[PDB]
Write a protein that binds this DNA or RNA. Structure first.
Ligand SMILES: Nc1nc2c(ncn2[C@@H]2O[C@@H](COP(=O)(O)OP(=O)(O)OP(=O)(O)OP(=O)(O)OC[C@H]3O[C@@H](n4cnc5c(N)ncnc54)[C@H](O)[C@@H]3O)[C@H](O)[C@@H]2O)c(=O)[nH]1
Ligand SMILES: [Mg+2]
Ligand SMILES: [Zn+2]
Lengths: 94, 213, 222, 1113, 170, 57, 32
DNA sequence: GCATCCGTGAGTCGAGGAAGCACAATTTAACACTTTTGTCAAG
DNA sequence: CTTGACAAAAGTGTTAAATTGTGCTATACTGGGAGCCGTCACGGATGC
């Protein structure tokens, strides 16, 4: 099973809300090239390559780990989508 | 070889019927989804814990498997006080709660359990979270937005192949789901009253007598 | 005449048309009965309708007669020789002006189209249309490589000057229009034809130099 | 390896020719050997005598005789050139002018009749095909009880299929008998009056019954004259048509009295005579003579129906599913029927041609148009359901296919129109149709296999042989009898003990009318020839059949067909005795015609000097590709100068060892779970099998290309393919084809072809690229042939056929065709499917090294590990007994032949195991070795389990374990013994045709359909996987809305969506939001074509255009 | 019919985890072809996408780094295994692919009862979810290790089976 | 109600009833093309018969 | 071919928004 | 109230691919001739 | 940047050859041919 899957299931009132949050966070990470991560450099997921350890390119795993840390605020009608995208671009240009 | 070929032909002509019944069940309940947490309905169903056995002509405790299939993962509509334990209204019945209810019935303290069921659900184009109960795949209350209609249809239609075909078995299930009139249909009393048998060699007649009817 | 590509009632109606024509053209002064003259027109109309309406791809009446004569000759030679004749014998028997190539082409033309819904197999769950790929619309790979080629060409043209890039796009149809001739582009820029040709050649040479120094555009040539 | 044979039943007769059902019937149909004057009125000769003479009504076209010429090409030439193996058929016809009195005779060429090879299969269009016999209801008169109303019976008159309408006779509640023809019901009194029957005759014949005869008397019809009655009958049958005596009598004669249109058949006439006790002059319901109709069968049928209704003792109802009432149409009957249809069409064409155009100057050649006959024959031999593509994976496969009986086909039952009545094993199937063997699934009970000793008679009724028993002694006289004749005698069982010829058992198990009974030897009238006659060829090849459940013996027999030949195939240790007969009758091996000496032995041919001195050269079929892709080769088994007796083996055929059918390998099998690699029927094999090349086969694949003529220009097959490097063209010779012997991998070019490109301007980007690189676009493009993914091998053959070649009839517009045969040597690998004769099947899940497999105490590792849990559920105990017997043979160095139901028993296997253990442990004692400590621990554990007697010496306990078939088995990894003794033996395992190499498929992007633009299907076409309704339901149940949307739009038919998704993925971006599928657009357009306005609206009910304005004017 | 879909015969894998399946290398290469082309473009294996596709077209032209790139691609991703008929909702299950040498799919024994799949010659189909939504749905909702109880009755459906029960009982 | 009787028969787009040329040069067409051809032939024949003053039968 | 009104496509959970701490704080500071 | 004709339905994958004849109306390959460039010298 | 000479590439205008479509056959012909068949159950009208 996915690491910390029980906590992720228990943190939301519906598993599909969990899936939506994870997918949206993964796409947000992909769009900005993982520069908007809330993970410390010691917490970033790593993959083992012949050259050496590298950052995990799977955005879903990154989103799941970030949501496990608990530093992500998720819900309905938080901020306007256009304003949120503009602010995220301003903080992390891509 | 006669019996072996009969069984093979039965399976061959039964798989198609089971698949077609599954398709019907999917296509009739494709719109049923958990659409709200609670619809606020006050109706319920009283799931019976005792079956009226006719050979003894008395109420006998049903099997544990039947009670579990009829009560596990269901919301109590009314508060139930059994064996010093108070299960409040809106409490999901887990396996421990089902076993407690079974023990209470064995102690002769409760005859039927009032639970919320989809039959009494007032949600339009679907059901509610508090009426469905647990998501049996996770042993926790059903998540809002699950396609419980498709799950129900698949669950009913999956063991159709395992049912024996040889008014019994899969054809019985098919005629039950289609609400068909059985060929050897039983005779029921239209109104309540006292029964009177007038068995005669010429004709057999049964009379239901009331105050004026 | 039934069984020659047209239904019975269609043949009857076409014969009715021929009968109407015969009534129009019939003459009773010759003292011949109406059946004798009407039969010619009825069979003519039926045969014309069979020639013009018994095939999904219409074939002219003269070519239909040619195909029928070829089939009759082939059948006669087949029954005479006790085997299927080759194209040489059929062409020889048809007459002057006929060779094996013409017979083969006529037989190829006489091939009726095959239905797309013909079942294959004991079960009726397959059709010809399930085995015919669509080769008209571009495949996803083709669209992707076209987009990549367009992007790479646009990036490569950035190295060119503002005027040279515009001249090359005009001369190669990159503005979605037909490739503008040298005079058209020159009039657009107010320049003579020779200078337009010279600047286009210079820009093409510069692009060749850049491609040689980079080799980031050769794979799309195929 | 000496062969020990078990059994006590002595067969008085040998097995009949297993292919006689296909061969003798076609020999009777053709009659190409009997002289024309001695030909009987059967088959195509009967068809000729039926349709001919043709009368214009004074021109007569009469038929005198027919002959068949020599085939234009041999079988090998037809196979190589994709021709049809056929013989020219000429007919001798005479034209007689009745008025003139002149006769014109000439031989007309009717066409080509396909010929049957010696093995019993046809070669149609270069492909081997087999005509499957069809079981159907025998024509005649039947009397079935009415299910709707008890106590009443209905008579059915059934002619040959498509040879007349079925007639129904019923007793109506009013008492008036009703006749039903072509769904039209009328009073039978009218038609009976048409046959000139008076009231007195009916009163005297049918009056000795109940009120039925009184109900049959209607003065309205009886007073009517026969002519007026016939007119009224015609009016009732066909309304609207004007009442004319000539037309009415013609219609009635064609309906119930015309031999050319109504044919009851020889079987139908025989059944009618047997049932009703009458003698029909012909095969028609009525006889039209002297301008009047005479009754043939209606009156006896009505009399029998009335007597059955009354309840006379001597009359009984007929069983529709009774195998005596069901007959078999072989290849001969079906071919004769199709030839009759074609000849009727030819006669119609002649009749419509002989009445118009130069009547005085006519010849039979001009009138006769043979095209309809050839068209019908080719349609029957190509596009018919019963003409199946030959299954020749192994000789047993073809042998079974030739002996298959199908209830489906033209004029027969249908897969989903068939109930339990036709699919059940009737009591009369004993000894005629194999009960166990049938294709499980939707076709269970509809396709069966003919029994071993069963043979189809002249009339089409299956007969079985029985030994005549008179006076309590069994004689050598054998009677071949059908089910209806079988029901009249008490037939004993083949296993009844005999003291020579006298029956010794006082209580004999016998059959009476299909039911089991216990009788005395004096009451025994017939005996079974052998237990083998009840089962077909496949089931007779399963040893210890009596210990296998029928449902699993079915699978074993079916999978015996699918075993592929192996380069090191060896005969099973435990046999039944039919392997030699199967090989001999399958015509796969090569045998000497008579006594002689072998002069020359070679891998290509064998030259033999017979006693008379003549040199006979037999070519050897070498590495010929079968229909299923397997390699069929014959390996010589003789040496130069070796003397051979008549019938001796000369060359082993495919899947054979010294004339014995060898479909697999005899491998050391241990029955025990192994680390979960045996889970759910999975099989574990040792690498030692691959080391010595066991289960290694040769498979040949054929790749075909065609160079044609195109309006853009003719496609040329050449080595100079544009825009290709020398590395890709390394294996291509100067002619553009791959050199023979070159190894080809997926993506490599087999034959090089360049096709002229369509005249079209290029895209502006491509033009700019060409201008930059200064490369002028060529006029041709690569359209060569490349090896599909997952295939390849060694190119072994190249065949190039060109237009104008002798006998090569290429399709019009095709310049040439090139075929490449590439052979690959496939070894056993993970995912390949193995099986055995007892139905135990599974895919190889692990290939362990030799040092990891469990090994015997002498150091011999096991080769295959089987899961024991497959035994108790499947109830196939025969594999355990075969394993025990194989262990005994392996340690004794001998093979065994145990016939089914009479063969090796438990005491015999136990004494053989005793001898095997004696030699096995005496060898160890002689080598100077006692009992292993691990063996001692295993013996202690076993005696704790009750497997061995406590208190015995270790040698005696080991002997007891060996007698139980179990040995002390060590573990190859730990070295410690398995805590319990393990059943280790030698078992015969076959490698099935289903291999993971041919089944693995994958696809990202590929071809798409025409209309719906969805991906194609099938590995050959490189298509995607079908995501049907049930998968969509599963996705909905999971609630994976986005995944379902992707699979419906992005990955299936959203053209713009899929293109954008692919572009985003190759650019490292995320796929975009999907759009409306093309399938919904097709839906909308088709609904509009049905004049239905389908409009898609938005929240405000405004129309929404999903076509982006492309369909808006 | 869907793109990015394959099919192959299944074999039992006892060493796999409950959330893993053995995807053949060739099937993974063909199914993940666009992702593999992108990864090869990222590294030095190929100059662009067209060159990478041409390299992958011919079997003998594939180098050894292509397999490493493919292993890098499938990291974290999951594939849906399907077996017809899909009688109930667990007939399609998400597994984490593991590259294996061979041509047969390695299936975990515990899910077999859920799939109603034995190893007498069964075939299964592999589907590849593409976007972040599809991957999240497969990994969170459709994962084999996340569906341990049968939705029909609530009893466990991925439970010890024939050989496991035999050994534990013994 | 009068819309239930067709006065103008709609015609499906030809790509949904394609007449394609296979790689072998043979033409493959759907049955809808044949149905449309029959309908058009009968309609044109009716028009010609009406223009020629054909009798009532 | 639309998003089904069940599972992740249900209106109850389809409009859920995930946002980090830093961007949310920036939005609040720039708005209020 | 009941017998009867008509219409609809009956599992999923995969692997199976028979006139010519004359004559007038329409199209087009073959040339012949201006028209339009594509390129080359001249700096 | 311009100013003239050349050498094909494409378009215009006949020219008949090839192709295509319509008209016409005058002893007398005057209503079709293939089916044809092993299923059960359930709406649902269609009448008696
Ligand atoms: C002469 O008939 P054929 O067509 O040649 O039949 P075979 O070649 O003998 O069949 P097979 O499939 O190769 O192998 P088998 O029956 O031993 O099981 C192989 C496995 O596929 C699956 N499976 C089989 N049939 C299926 C069906 N109808 N629908 C769905 N799944 C089916 C089962 O999961 C079987 O367990
Ligand atoms: Mg299986
Ligand atoms: Zn509710």
């Amino acid at each position: 099973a996915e690491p910390g899957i029980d906590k992720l299931f228990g943190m939301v009132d519906s598993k599909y809300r969990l899936t939506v949050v994870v997918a949206k966070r993964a796409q947000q990470l992909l769009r900005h090239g993982f520069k908007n991560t809330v993970l410390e450099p010691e917490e970033r997921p790593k993959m083992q390559t012949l050259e050496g350890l590298f950052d995990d390119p799977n955005a879903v795993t990154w989103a799941m780990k970030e949501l496990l840390t608990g530093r992500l605020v998720f819900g309905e009608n938080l901020v306007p989508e256009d304003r949120l995208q503009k602010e995220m671009e301003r903080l992390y240009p891509v | 070889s006669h019996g072996a070929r009969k069984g093979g032909a039965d399976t061959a002509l039964r798989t198609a019927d089971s698949g077609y019944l599954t398709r019907k069940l999917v296509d009739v309940t494709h719109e049923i989804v958990v659409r709200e947490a609670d619809c606020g309905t006050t109706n319920y169903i009283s799931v019976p814990l005792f079956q009226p056995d006719e050979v003894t002509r008395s109420l006998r405790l049903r099997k544990r498997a039947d009670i579990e299939a009829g009560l596990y993962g269901r919301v109590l509509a009314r508060e139930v006080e059994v064996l010093g334990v108070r299960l409040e209204e809106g409490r999901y019945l887990s396996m421990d709660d089902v076993h407690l209810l079974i023990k209470a019935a064995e102690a002769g303290e409760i005859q039927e359990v009032p639970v919320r069921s989809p039959l009494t659900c007032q949600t339009r184009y679907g059901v509610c979270q508090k009426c469905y109960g647990y998501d049996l795949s996770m042993a926790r209350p059903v998540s809002i937005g699950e396609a419980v209609g498709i799950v129900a249809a698949q669950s009913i239609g999956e063991p159709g192949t395992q049912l024996t075909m040889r008014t019994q078995g899969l054809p019985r299930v098919i005629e039950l789901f289609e609400a068909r009139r059985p060929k050897a249909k039983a005779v029921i009393s239209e109104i309540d009253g006292v029964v009177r048998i007038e068995e005669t060699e010429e004709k057999l007649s049964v009379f239901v007598e009331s105050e004026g009817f | 005449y039934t069984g020659r590509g047209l239904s019975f009632l269609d043949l009857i109606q076409e014969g009715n048309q021929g009968l109407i024509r015969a009534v129009e053209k019939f003459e009773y002064k010759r003292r011949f009965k109406f059946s004798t003259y009407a039969t010619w027109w009825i069979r003519q109309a039926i045969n014309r309708a069979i020639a013009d309406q018994a095939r999904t791809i219409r074939i002219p009446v003269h070519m239909v007669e040619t195909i029928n004569k070829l089939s009759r000759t082939a059948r006669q030679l087949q029954q005479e020789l006790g085997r299927e004749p080759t194209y040489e014998e059929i062409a020889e028997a048809m007459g002057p002006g006929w060779d094996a190539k013409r017979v083969e082409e006529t037989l190829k033309i006489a091939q009726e189209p095959v239905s797309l819904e013909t079942p294959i197999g004991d079960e009726k769950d397959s059709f010809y249309g399930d085995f015919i790929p669509d080769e008209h619309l571009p495949s996803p790979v083709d669209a992707a490589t076209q987009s990549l080629l367009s992007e790479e060409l646009e990036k490569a043209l950035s190295k060119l000057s503002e005027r040279e890039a515009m001249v090359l796009k005009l001369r190669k149809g990159l503005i979605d229009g037909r490739e503008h001739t040298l005079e058209e582009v020159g009039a657009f820029f107010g320049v003579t034809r020779e200078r337009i040709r010279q600047i286009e050649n210079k820009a093409l040479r510069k692009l060749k130099y850049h491609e040689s120094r980079t080799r980031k555009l050769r794979d799309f040539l195929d | 390896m000496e062969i020990k044979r078990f059994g006590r039943i002595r067969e008085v007769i040998p097995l009949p020719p297993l292919t006689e059902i296909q061969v003798e019937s076609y020999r009777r149909a053709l009659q190409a050997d009997v002289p024309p004057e001695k030909r009987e009125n059967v088959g195509i000769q009967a068809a000729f005598r039926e349709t001919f003479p043709i009368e214009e009504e004074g021109l007569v076209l009469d038929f005198l005789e027919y002959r068949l010429g020599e085939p234009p090409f041999p079988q090998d030439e037809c196979r190589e050139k994709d021709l049809t193996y056929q013989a020219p058929l000429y007919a001798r016809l005479q034209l007689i002018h009745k008025d003139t009195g002149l006769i014109k005779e000439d031989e007309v060429f009717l066409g080509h009749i396909p010929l049957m090879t010696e093995d019993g299969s046809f070669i149609i269009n270069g492909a081997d095909r087999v005509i499957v016999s069809q079981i159907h209801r025998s024509p005649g008169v039947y009397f079935t009880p009415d299910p709707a109303r008890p106590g009443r019976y209905i008579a059915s008159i059934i002619p040959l299929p498509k040879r007349g309408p079925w007639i129904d006779l019923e007793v109506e509640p009013n008492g008036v008998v009703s006749m039903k023809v072509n769904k039209r019901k009328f009073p039978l009194v009218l038609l009976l009056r048409v046959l000139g029957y008076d009231q007195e005759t009916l009163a005297r014949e049918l009056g000795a019954y109940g009120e039925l005869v009184q109900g049959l008397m209607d003065e309205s019809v009886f007073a009517m004259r026969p002519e007026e009655a016939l007119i009224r009958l015609f009016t009732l049958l066909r309304p609207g048509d004007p009442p004319k005596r000539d037309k009415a009598v013609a219609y009635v004669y064609g309906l119930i009295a015309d031999p050319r249109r109504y044919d009851l058949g020889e079987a139908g006439r025989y059944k009618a005579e047997e049932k009703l006790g009458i003698r029909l002059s012909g095969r028609t319901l009525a006889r039209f003579e002297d301008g009047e109709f005479k009754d043939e069968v209606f009156l006896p049928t009505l009399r029998y129906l009335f007597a059955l209704t009354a309840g006379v003792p001597g009359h009984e109802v007929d069983d529709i599913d009774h195998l005596g009432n069901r007959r078999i149409r072989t290849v001969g009957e079906l071919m004769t029927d199709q030839f009759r249809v074609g000849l009727a069409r030819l006669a119609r064409g002649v009749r419509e041609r002989m009445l118009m155009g130069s009547e005085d100057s006519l010849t039979p050649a001009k009138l006769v148009n043979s095209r309809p006959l050839e068209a019908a024959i080719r349609e029957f031999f190509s596009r018919s359901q019963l003409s199946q593509f030959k299954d020749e994976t192994n000789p047993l496969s073809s042998l079974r296919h030739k002996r298959r009986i199908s209830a489906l086909g033209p004029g027969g039952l249908t897969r989903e129109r068939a109930g339990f009545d036709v699919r059940d094993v009737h009591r009369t199937h004993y000894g005629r149709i194999c009960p166990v063997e049938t294709p499980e699934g939707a076709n269970i009970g509809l396709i069966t296999s003919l029994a071993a000793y069963a043979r189809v008679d002249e009339l089409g009724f299956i007969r079985t042989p029985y030994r005549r028993v008179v006076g309590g002694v069994v004689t050598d006289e054998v009677v071949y009898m059908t089910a209806t004749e079988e029901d009249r005698y008490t037939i004993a069982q083949a296993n009844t003990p005999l003291e020579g010829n006298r029956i010794a058992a006082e209580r004999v198990v016998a059959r009476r009318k299909g039911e089991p009974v216990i009788v005395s030897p004096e009451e025994v009238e017939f005996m079974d020839v052998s237990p083998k006659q009840v089962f077909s060829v496949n089931t007779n090849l399963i040893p210890f059949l009596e210990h296998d459940d029928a449902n699993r013996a079915l699978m074993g027999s079916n999978m015996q067909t699918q075993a592929v030949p192996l380069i090191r195939a060896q005969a099973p240790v435990v046999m039944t005795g039919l392997e030699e007969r199967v090989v001999r009758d399958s015509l796969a091996a090569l045998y000497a015609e008579e006594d002689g000496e072998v002069a020359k032995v070679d891998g290509n041919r064998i030259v033999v000097r017979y006693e008379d001195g003549r040199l006979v050269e037999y070519p050897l079929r070498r590495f010929y590709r079968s229909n299923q892709g397997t390699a069929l080769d014959q390996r010589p088994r003789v040496v130069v100068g070796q003397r051979v007796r008549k019938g001796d083996l000369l060359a082993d055929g495919p899947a054979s060892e010294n004339g014995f059918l060898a479909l697999g390998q005899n491998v050391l099998v241990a029955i025990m779970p192994f680390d979960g690699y045996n889970f759910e029927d999975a099989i574990v094999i040792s690498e030692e099998l691959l080391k010595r090349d066991f289960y290694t086969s040769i498979h040949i694949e054929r790749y075909e290309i065609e160079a044609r003529d195109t309006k853009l220009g003719p496609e040329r097959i050449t080595r100079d393919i544009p825009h290709l490097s020398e590395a890709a063209l390394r294996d291509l010779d100067e002619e553009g084809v791959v050199r023979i012997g070159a190894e080809v991998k997926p993506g490599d070019i087999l034959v090089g072809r360049t096709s002229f490109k369509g005249e079209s301007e290029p895209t502006p980007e491509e033009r700019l690229l060409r201008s930059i690189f200064g490369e002028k676009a060529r006029d041709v493009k690569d359209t060569s042939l490349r090896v599909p993914p997952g295939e390849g091998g060694i190119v072994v053959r190249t065949v190039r056929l060109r237009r104008g070649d002798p006998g090569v009839e290429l399709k019009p517009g095709v310049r040439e065709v090139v075929r490449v045969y590439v052979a690959q040597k496939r070894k056993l690998q993970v995912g390949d499917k193995l099986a055995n004769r007892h139905g135990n099947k599974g895919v190889v899940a692990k290939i362990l090294p030799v040092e990891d497999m469990p090994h015997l105490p002498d150091g011999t590792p096991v080769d295959v590990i089987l899961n024991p849990l497959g035994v108790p559920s499947r109830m196939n105990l025969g594999q355990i007994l075969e394993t025990h017997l194989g262990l005994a043979g392996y340690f004794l160095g001998q093979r065994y032949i145990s016939p089914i139901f009479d063969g090796a028993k438990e005491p015999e296997i136990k004494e053989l195991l005793a001898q095997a253990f004696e030699v096995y442990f005496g060898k160890r004692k002689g080598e100077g070795f006692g009992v292993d400590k691990r063996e001692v621990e295993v013996l202690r554990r076993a005696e704790k389990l009750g497997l061995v007697t406590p208190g015995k010496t270790p040698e005696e306990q080991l002997k007891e374990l060996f007698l139980q078939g179990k040995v002390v088995l060590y573990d190859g990894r730990t070295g410690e013994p398995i805590e319990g003794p393990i059943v280790v033996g030698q078992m015969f395992i076959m490698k099935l045709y289903h291999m993971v190499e041919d089944k693995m498929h994958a696809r990202s992007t590929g071809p798409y359909s025409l209309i719906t633009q969805q991906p194609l299907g099938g590995k050959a076409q490189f298509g995607g996987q079908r995501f049907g309704e049930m998968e969509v339901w599963a996705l909905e149940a999971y609630g994976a809305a986005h995944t379902l949307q992707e699979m419906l739009t992005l990955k299936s038919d959203d053209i713009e969506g899929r293109n954008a998704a692919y572009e985003a993925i190759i650019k490292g971006e995320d796929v975009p939001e999907p759009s409306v599928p093309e399938s919904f657009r097709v839906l909308v357009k088709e609904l509009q074509a049905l004049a239905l306005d389908v409009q898609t609206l938005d929240e405000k009910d405004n129309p929404v255009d999903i076509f982006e304005g492309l369909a808006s004017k | 019919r869907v793109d990015y879909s394959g099919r192959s015969v299944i074999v039992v894998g006892p060493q796999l985890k409950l959330h893993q399946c053995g995807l053949p290398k060739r099937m993974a290469l063909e199914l993940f072809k666009p992702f593999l082309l992108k990864k090869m473009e990222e590294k030095g294996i190929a100059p662009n996408v067209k060159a990478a596709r041409r390299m992958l077209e011919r079997q003998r032209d594939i180098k050894d780094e292509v397999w490493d790139a493919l292993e890098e691609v499938i990291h974290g991703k999951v594939v849906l295994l399907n077996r017809a008929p899909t009688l109930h909702r667990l007939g399609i299950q998400a597994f984490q692919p593991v590259l294996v040498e061979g041509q047969s799919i390695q299936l975990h024994p515990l899910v077999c009862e859920a799939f109603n799949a034995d190893f007498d010659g069964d075939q299964m189909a592999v589907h590849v979810p593409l976007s972040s939504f599809a991957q999240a749905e497969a990994r969170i909702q459709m994962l084999s290790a996340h569906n341990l109880l049968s939705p029909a009755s609530g009893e466990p459906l991925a439970k010890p089976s024939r050989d496991i029960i035999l050994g534990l009982y013994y | 109600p009068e819309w239930m009787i067709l006065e103008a028969v709609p015609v499906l787009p030809p790509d949904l009833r394609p007449m394609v040329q296979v790689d072998g040069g043979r033409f493959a067409t759907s049955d809808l093309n044949d149905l449309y051809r029959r309908l058009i032939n009968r309609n044109n024949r009716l028009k010609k018969l009406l223009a020629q003053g054909a009798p009532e039968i | 071919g639309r998003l089904i009104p069940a599972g992740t496509g249900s209106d109850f959970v389809r409009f859920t928004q995930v946002v980090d701490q830093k961007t949310l704080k920036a939005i609040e500071e720039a708005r209020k």
